[PDB]
Amino acid sequence: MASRILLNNGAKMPILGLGTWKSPPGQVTEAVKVAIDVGYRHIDCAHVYQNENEVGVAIQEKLREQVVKREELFIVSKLWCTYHEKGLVKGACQKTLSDLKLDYLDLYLIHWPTGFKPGKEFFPLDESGNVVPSDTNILDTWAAMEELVDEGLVKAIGISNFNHLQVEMILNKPGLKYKPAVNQIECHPYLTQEKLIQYCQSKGIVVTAYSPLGSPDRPWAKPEDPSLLEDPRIKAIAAKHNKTTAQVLIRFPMQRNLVVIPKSVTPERIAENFKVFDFELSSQDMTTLLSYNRNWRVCALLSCTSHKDYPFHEEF
Ligand SMILES: NC(=O)c1ccc[n+]([C@@H]2O[C@H](COP(=O)([O-])OP(=O)(O)OC[C@H]3O[C@@H](n4cnc5c(N)ncnc54)[C@H](OP(=O)(O)O)[C@@H]3O)[C@@H](O)[C@H]2O)c1
Ligand SMILES: O=C(O)COc1cc(F)ccc1C(=O)NCc1nc2ccccc2s1
């Protein structure tokens, strides 16, 4: 298991990164410092997570300490839905750069394929609770992302939560200049994504798996939801390998040629989650884990389901 995967822009991306959604601003600086100390070289960020400044403090301190060189880090962020408008994309990227204390991003993603009305509110709603769309389309937003590459603000661009028809739309964009390097999507044994993954990989697009542990700290969790970390079938595979269930859940996408970005602010877990390069799941383990698919999503917000570009109506 090599540590980095080659992207279609010629750069190499670490297959294990640290997630930062829900990482409290008073804890995430130390979390990222610990992560870098124990070997992480890829951090997954987003403006909408409201903690980029604090993530940036950690990155900058480790650069200043000369624990790691900037060239050895792979920092990812994402353009929020309220910034899809052409004239807002660069400023959104620059705000993220300023908060992260970087002069470039390794990868910048369209966070969701849905544009929302610009403003201070991340989820602008009408009086009945429906998200208010913007009249932007994914193709023009993509052209705006391409400009960021051409101004040196980002080394690679990509997409997130795009279904295969939406990926196809970009691949078929008139005058397409840069193909997406990555599609970052939810993926775990309850949402295995065989079709979308094969499609993306067949086009040379690297897939990143988010919520690989099933996001047990998601704020909308319900008692009746399935629970990966507590699934006796997955625990059994972990026991066989003398690893934790979380370690199995992280190793699983790695063996599908995916990048994976588990989140933690707990130092012991940050370290545990990185110790996944010293064992191998069997082909049988892999197919067995795949067999647990439920088409169950952590991320699929009801208020956005009428947006014309809502991604999860399509089969894949
Ligand atoms: N592109 C998108 O739309 C999108 C959507 C969702 C997520 N993401 C990215 O993917 C990252 C990961 O997904 P996620 O945050 O939803 O959830 P996740 O990584 O599946 O799970 C995080 C949860 O698992 C716990 N945890 C971590 N390591 C553990 C271990 N070894 N043993 C037991 N529990 C453990 C964490 O607790 P503690 O932190 O308390 O240790 C936290 O409650 C996000 O942080 C974000 O960077 C992107
Ligand atoms: O979107 C993420 O990366 C993680 O989820 C969130 C993070 C935040 F900081 C704030 C909100 C969310 C959240 O509600 N995410 C669930 C979402 N589902 C859809 C569906 C269509 C369009 C946009 C969204 S956002």
From Swiss-Prot:
<dbReference type="GO" id="GO:0005829">
    <property type="term" value="C:cytosol"/>
</dbReference>
<dbReference type="GO" id="GO:0071475">
    <property type="term" value="P:cellular hyperosmotic salinity response"/>
</dbReference>
<feature type="site" description="Lowers pKa of active site Tyr">
    <location>
        <position position="78"/>
    </location>
</feature>
<feature type="modified residue" description="N6-acetyllysine">
    <location>
        <position position="95"/>
    </location>
</feature>
<dbReference type="InterPro" id="IPR023210">
    <property type="entry name" value="NADP_OxRdtase_dom"/>
</dbReference>
<dbReference type="GO" id="GO:0047939">
    <property type="term" value="F:L-glucuronate reductase activity"/>
</dbReference>
<dbReference type="GO" id="GO:0005975">
    <property type="term" value="P:carbohydrate metabolic process"/>
</dbReference>
<dbReference type="GO" id="GO:0044597">
    <property type="term" value="P:daunorubicin metabolic process"/>
</dbReference>
<feature type="binding site">
    <location>
        <position position="111"/>
    </location>
    <ligand>
        <name>substrate</name>
    </ligand>
</feature>
<dbReference type="GO" id="GO:0043066">
    <property type="term" value="P:negative regulation of apoptotic process"/>
</dbReference>
<dbReference type="GO" id="GO:0002070">
    <property type="term" value="P:epithelial cell maturation"/>
</dbReference>
<dbReference type="GO" id="GO:0001523">
    <property type="term" value="P:retinoid metabolic process"/>
</dbReference>
<dbReference type="GO" id="GO:0009055">
    <property type="term" value="F:electron transfer activity"/>
</dbReference>
<dbReference type="GO" id="GO:0005739">
    <property type="term" value="C:mitochondrion"/>
</dbReference>
<dbReference type="InterPro" id="IPR036812">
    <property type="entry name" value="NADP_OxRdtase_dom_sf"/>
</dbReference>
<comment type="subunit">
    <text>Monomer.</text>
</comment>
<dbReference type="GO" id="GO:0003091">
    <property type="term" value="P:renal water homeostasis"/>
</dbReference>
<dbReference type="GO" id="GO:0043795">
    <property type="term" value="F:glyceraldehyde oxidoreductase activity"/>
</dbReference>
<dbReference type="GO" id="GO:0047655">
    <property type="term" value="F:allyl-alcohol dehydrogenase activity"/>
</dbReference>
<dbReference type="GO" id="GO:0044598">
    <property type="term" value="P:doxorubicin metabolic process"/>
</dbReference>
<keyword id="KW-0443">Lipid metabolism</keyword>
<dbReference type="GO" id="GO:0001758">
    <property type="term" value="F:retinal dehydrogenase activity"/>
</dbReference>
<keyword id="KW-0963">Cytoplasm</keyword>
<protein>
    <recommendedName>
        <fullName>Aldo-keto reductase family 1 member B1</fullName>
        <ecNumber>1.1.1.21</ecNumber>
        <ecNumber>1.1.1.300</ecNumber>
        <ecNumber>1.1.1.372</ecNumber>
        <ecNumber>1.1.1.54</ecNumber>
    </recommendedName>
</protein>
<keyword id="KW-0521">NADP</keyword>
<dbReference type="GO" id="GO:0005654">
    <property type="term" value="C:nucleoplasm"/>
</dbReference>
<feature type="modified residue" description="Phosphoserine">
    <location>
        <position position="3"/>
    </location>
</feature>
<keyword id="KW-0560">Oxidoreductase</keyword>
<dbReference type="GO" id="GO:0072205">
    <property type="term" value="P:metanephric collecting duct development"/>
</dbReference>
<dbReference type="Pfam" id="PF00248">
    <property type="entry name" value="Aldo_ket_red"/>
</dbReference>
<dbReference type="GO" id="GO:0052650">
    <property type="term" value="F:all-trans-retinol dehydrogenase (NADP+) activity"/>
</dbReference>
<dbReference type="GO" id="GO:0004032">
    <property type="term" value="F:aldose reductase (NADPH) activity"/>
</dbReference>
<feature type="binding site">
    <location>
        <begin position="10"/>
        <end position="19"/>
    </location>
    <ligand>
        <name>NADP(+)</name>
    </ligand>
</feature>
<feature type="modified residue" description="N-acetylalanine">
    <location>
        <position position="2"/>
    </location>
</feature>
<dbReference type="GO" id="GO:0036130">
    <property type="term" value="F:prostaglandin H2 endoperoxidase reductase activity"/>
</dbReference>
<feature type="active site" description="Proton donor">
    <location>
        <position position="49"/>
    </location>
</feature>
<comment type="function">
    <text>Catalyzes the NADPH-dependent reduction of a wide variety of carbonyl-containing compounds to their corresponding alcohols. Displays enzymatic activity towards endogenous metabolites such as aromatic and aliphatic aldehydes, ketones, monosacharides, bile acids and xenobiotics substrates. Key enzyme in the polyol pathway, catalyzes reduction of glucose to sorbitol during hyperglycemia. Reduces steroids and their derivatives and prostaglandins. Displays low enzymatic activity toward all-trans-retinal, 9-cis-retinal, and 13-cis-retinal.</text>
</comment>
<dbReference type="GO" id="GO:0070062">
    <property type="term" value="C:extracellular exosome"/>
</dbReference>
<dbReference type="GO" id="GO:0046370">
    <property type="term" value="P:fructose biosynthetic process"/>
</dbReference>
<comment type="similarity">
    <text>Belongs to the aldo/keto reductase family.</text>
</comment>
<feature type="modified residue" description="N6-acetyllysine">
    <location>
        <position position="263"/>
    </location>
</feature>
<dbReference type="GO" id="GO:0047956">
    <property type="term" value="F:glycerol dehydrogenase (NADP+) activity"/>
</dbReference>
